[model samples]
Target chain A: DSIQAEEWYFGKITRRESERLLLNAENPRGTFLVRESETTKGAYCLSVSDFDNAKGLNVKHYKIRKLDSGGFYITSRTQFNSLQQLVAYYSKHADGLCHRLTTVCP
Target chain B: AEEWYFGKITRRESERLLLNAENPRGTFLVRESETTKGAYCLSVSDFDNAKGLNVKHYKIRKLDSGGFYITSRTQFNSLQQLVAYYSKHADGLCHRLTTVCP
Candidate 1:
């Protein structure tokens, strides 16, 4: 009931699959999902959908790395003790992401 | 005997108690587990604009060596201790324990 309970957490979904889910509809500006990283073991990927003038609508993926202390972070300066806290913070403030997490991936 | 601890209750009843005007996000209660004999369950309420209001239930396992833990990373000598730890920090739970279910 921890990370799995989160709506945006898409367990072991593939990168290609996640992009398809986020691109399924005209997702609101910042639809996103956190999925197990296919390339890195025990790591997660933050997949987001956004739009740019030149690129039109596109999906971006960020690797959510973890510290030895079990905390999670994308940017070294900003570390969160829990994945939920990290997600909550990124939801309100885009920080380094392409957009503020607005909607959960369907 | 703690107000936050309900000795024995069904999951549905726990959810019903948590989804109320008074019990907002992070409000939670510990109830006796129906499936696991002698074990307990921690039910917490969480809210988000996308998912709305929902209750998440975590099974609290009793160690054979005499301790309680939701995850191996965090263990406690008693349920009170476990609740206290989670209250201060959300840890891996949905949210921090901000209120206790009355």
Candidate 2:
């Protein structure tokens, strides 16, 4: 098992759609506000505020897991690109309500 | 018709294309094809590796007529800072491997 440290906070409610919500953080910029669905058992759908302006823009998705301390951890693929952005966003937007979670291997 | 599968970048053969090919960005993509054919677009975010500092993961989305399309959004500072950080941190560490896709 690994020791995981995490943080959580209320993301900005930028907008919402019939099945999704739009969220923006300082570091990353935006995320989808999603409700759990059968197909998305442990994940959420994401969208941009302006799809037209998002041409050729790349965003990654992750499983946001809540921790015992009310913080959250993101689990996803191997590429390090998106993780960097996620962390940066957290660092800048980190408040008592929002924070970052880290995982330490033994 | 179209289909897409979500998976992580478990390994990388070339570092020239991806710096943290193993630890920073969580990689995921969506593929779209027509009648048994199509294209794919992969999106990778958290490219700065600043906070929790983990690799990026992907959630594949598929479209039929649209084909494959991926996109990203990031801070100008993070990208610039990472360039300096990696230059020093990963100077000679080639061929990175880890539990990125599990």
Candidate 3:
């Protein structure tokens, strides 16, 4: 339930570093990690590794906005009070993401 | 025959309905073309922070042989067939047809 305790939360890492970690994953498809935004202050990004038939080893990143009223969300329709809750929800459903959060980045 | 088919409505009306925050991406409608006498228009909703919600219109033209198509390479005999084909594949559209416009 805690963001820091979760292995998926790679706080403040460079975008390339997150992708490197995801690419190195044992079974990379749907593997993902949450990292602090590189450009946006106080915001976060959800990076997922999706395998494409033609592209192969494709990586997609979705921005998770830090709400003004205090919550986190990628799509406005679903908001969560904490990163843990957000990750948990996406882990179960791809929703609007390129792929579901299959495994934590190693 | 689909709810998305709003026959004879002008371009302004299609834009008004499709370019809405509640419509979500890929929402679309088919309407009669104003400039082209026999052609139809396919309007779809798209969203991004830079432009917010906007509609992309594609012209669905009829072949001399009576086939319907937006792009020359893919043709259909009926509007329903055309909608069904594009619903599954974006092909030449801005986005795949996701849902009928609400």
Candidate 4:
């Protein structure tokens, strides 16, 4: 409920790693490029790329979700048409209890 | 197990030296140990908020790709103090590169 809450996770990646992944990176998971693994909160790996229909550095934040399907989902509150919209939101405002792990209120 | 020429300059100059703390291979700044002095070397990298003299020259290193940190400006000050990390990559030898990129 409080997005302003300070949530500090243990492990994290530097902007460089993120930048490299967003730029010239490769992976077998198609061009999705699973860059970040088990963020500081032990949840959700990030999927991003400049190669896909993506432009610039878009953090698709691909994550495995629980449901009937066995794969990641681009779900969150307020609703986003696609990963593009989520990326745009975080890009403008980076300071926060990074929702990379989960957007659901805990 | 060696000595480096970490010269002194203004704090403003120090900021400039950090421009390349993680440019793969770039010069970095540091507050030389009060007991040392010599040729001025710089590039632009980061790591470590250790201030004041008594800082060594050869201790700076790359904590990750985008971040550079100097040797624990502290004697026996292990960087393990960082119970957390931004990205998983820290190397002492990599940061040892002064004239070349690692």
Candidate 5:
């Protein structure tokens, strides 16, 4: 039971630590951005389930560059002019693709 | 109660949709801006309602090496700048990625 309390499933952990677990553990779980402050500063009123669900949340951020006529390119070494284009290309092509490959594309 | 539009959602409801029984709780749908394909994005919509807007997605990108970074979605090279500009109005989520890599 106490081991369940240690789970990083939702708001239980910060984005900082979530990836660490992702880097190693299986059973790809996700998380929430808690406040230690969920219902505060720009937070919501917690429900019973919300409190229960808050147990194991996890969380991302990013850089900049320009796209030429060829469009834009991400590290996976692909180019696209529009967000539509980038997602479109990777939606099909492999190699240098996103882990969330399917949904992000459509 | 009121219709939750682009900015109508309360902070409480926002968090609920983000991490409560109201949402799928585990998975998220991600989207990107076509204008600045790699930079700006609109990822993770709330499956139940417009509450997805509560998900703060603006300036960032998925890195080639792995992990993500702040980037401009509409105006190329704008995310970090956007965070700076909005820090006065919004809470900035761009923490310098450290401790470990994603």
Candidate 6:
């Protein structure tokens, strides 16, 4: 049997390092602004009887880039127990600013 | 009841977690802006909720790279869950990649 898979993409606005930023909360260094690519997307798939022990979970891998057309591109390939879990995870963690991928598995 | 705190990404280190291969953790998404570097951050919802959940996201701008990266801490039911998530998502294309704990 083949293993199931899932992916998600999000628009990153800016980033900071705790050691550098987070000091004044007003203006800080080590920060930058990023324009998201074609919005964002996520995907997920389930295998048959894959439920044994959530003992061996996997890390989700992702990639992001900037396009010449004036934006960024984000791609993610990760493992999740279920689509619900994936959605809940991203939804809960998502900054609620970028677009969520809904066409693939949502 | 569970409590959580969400904020915006203000600096690059938090954003580097997703962009810099040397250090990637907080980044998750990116946005467009002409003014100050805009980003986002997620922390523990609360101490009581820390057992099952403790994750954060980052949105940062790439100065030299001239782009952005998004990364986040994993969401798991337990320590094992967290380990599994990180193990699968580590930098190495294959397993055996180094792992970090928060």
Best by DockQ: 4
Off by more than 4 A, model 2: A1-28, A31-34, A37-60, A66-71, A76-106, B1-102
lDDT of 2 by residue, B2-102 (tens): 11122222223112223323434433222222223333223232344354433232222334533222223311232223223333443222212212121
Segments of candidate 6 deviating more than 4 angstroms: A1-4, A7-101, B1-8, B12-15, B23-102
Local distance difference test, per candidate?
Answer: 0.83, 0.28, 0.82, 0.33, 0.32, 0.28
lDDT of 4: 0.33
The residue-by-residue lDDT of candidate 1 on A36-86, one tens digit each, is 876667789899998777856667888898889789999876999887898
TM-score of each: 0.49, 0.22, 0.49, 0.22, 0.23, 0.16
Q: Which ten residues in a row have the lowest lDDT in candidate 1 chain A?
A: A16-25
Candidate 1 interface RMSD, angstroms, 1 decimal: 19.3
The DockQ-based CAPRI class assigned to model 3 is incorrect
lDDT of 1: 0.83
Model 4's TM-score against the true structure: 0.22
Q: Is the docking of candidate 1 incorrect, acceptable, medium or high quality?
A: incorrect
lDDT per residue, candidate 2, A8-101, as tens digits?
A: 2222211112112222222233333322211223332222222234442233333444444444345432112333354455444433212232
Which portions of model 5 show Cα errors greater than 4 Å?
A2-11, A20-106, B1-39, B42-76, B89-102
Query: On lDDT, who's better, 2 or 5?
Result: 5
Worst 10 residues of 2 chain A by lDDT: A10-19
TM-score, cand. 3 vs. native: 0.49
Comparing candidate 3 with candidate 4, which one achieves the higher DockQ? 4
Error of 4 at A37 (Å): 4.0
When just chain B is superposed on the true chain B, each candidate scores a TM-score of 0.92, 0.23, 0.91, 0.25, 0.26, 0.21
Which candidate do you rate higher for TM-score, 2 or 3?
Answer: 3
Candidate 3 lDDT by residue in tens digits, B1-102:
255676676788677656533766889989999989999999998877888778889999988998899987789998999999999999878789997865
Query: lDDT per residue, candidate 4, A67-89, as tens digits?
Result: 33332334443333333344444
Cα lDDT tens digits for candidate 3, A1-106: 3676778888877555666677663865889999876656688999899887686675688889988899998996799998889989999988889888888888
Q: Name model 1 segments beyond 4 Å from true.
A: B1-102
